[PDB]
Amino acid sequence: STGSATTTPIDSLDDAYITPVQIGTPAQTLNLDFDTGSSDLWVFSSETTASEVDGQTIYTPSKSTTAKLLSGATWSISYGDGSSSSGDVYTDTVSVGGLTVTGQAVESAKKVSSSFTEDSTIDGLLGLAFSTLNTVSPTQQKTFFDNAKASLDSPVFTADLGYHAPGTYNFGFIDTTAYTGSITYTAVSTKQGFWEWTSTGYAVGSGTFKSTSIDGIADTGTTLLYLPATVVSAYWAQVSGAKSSSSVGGYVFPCSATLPSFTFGVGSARIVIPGDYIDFGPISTGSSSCFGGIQSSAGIGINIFGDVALKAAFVVFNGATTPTLGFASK
Ligand SMILES: NCc1ccc(C(F)(F)F)cc1
Ligand SMILES: NCc1ccc(C(F)(F)F)cc1
């Protein structure tokens, strides 16, 4: 079987993407953030503290004839940006774009951090990293992808994120009309639970390509591109007036500047990120300083190929027994 769902940016900056997901019987439709950097499916629910809910659609297990409380199970998660949430665990039927999994662990948030409360358009997260990162205790739970793997025509899903436009998550098949040229596959390390791979280098604008290994993770749940300080400094040096601001927490640049493109290597192939993708707009309403989409990973400890990079490509997450990542131009 297969599944296919449209994913839509939540705002005009492509800060995140939401995808409708059907949970329960009868279906309750929630808009979830598909996150290949985490492995928990958690939702705002009727059990969430009422003051921590501001416009979200909530999952109500008591109205689902297929929901079962997973006795004694709890979950607690903290994301790399400081966000967190926690609660209890149900099992229920979950469907994405026609692809149905029964007995999926649905983690019901009793408490959420402020950053989720303020994001009225995101009803929860759907983790798509490896199940070793799932936070359910005492019994670890499998991701939606892991549960679906057996019935999928092919153990893959693909991410086709749009620039200021809707995109597609496909499960179980590779749409050969969605990209140009060939798909270049590269090896994945699962030792930390992430879709971790090694990029073969980079180029700034029309400059020479610098062959150098950059280890990082493919993370649809992170907005920006986080790279080593040496790379990020070489990019922003080509933007007149750009500077790293400690008060802002990263590189900013004059909104009137034109940004050079950024190329990253996948094996022998090259993925070009247009300079317009790196502009994340004024740091405050009316400001003439704009926030950059390429930032240093030094404070983070891991390099992150977030949405800025991934939306420049058609990306195959190959969940075969030896997993690989595929990249194609589009
Ligand atoms: N998108 C989920 C996520 C969030 C943070 C991290 C970090 F910061 F730990 F690398 C990885 C993955
Ligand atoms: N990387 C996971 C993640 C995704 C979204 C959010 C936000 F924006 F909703 F706070 C935080 C953390």
UniProtKB/Swiss-Prot annotation:
Keyword check for Protease: yes
Name the record gives this protein: Endothiapepsin
Keywords: Aspartyl protease, Disulfide bond, Hydrolase, Protease, Signal, Zymogen
GO molecular function: aspartic-type endopeptidase activity
Catalytic activity: Hydrolysis of proteins with specificity similar to that of pepsin A, prefers hydrophobic residues at P1 and P1', but does not cleave 14-Ala-|-Leu-15 in the B chain of insulin or Z-Glu-Tyr. Clots milk
Enzyme class: hydrolase
Domain of life of the source: Eukaryota
EC numbers for this chain: 3.4.23.22
Family (UniProt): Belongs to the peptidase A1 family.
Coverage span on the entire protein: 90 to 419 of 419
Disulfide-bond pairs as recorded: C255-C290
Residue ranges that the Swiss-Prot or TrEMBL entry lists as coiled coil: none
GO terms (BP aspect): proteolysis
Record carries keyword Protease: yes
Every Peptidase A1 domain range: 17-328
Active site positions, chain numbering: D35, S199
Gene that specifies this protein: EAPA
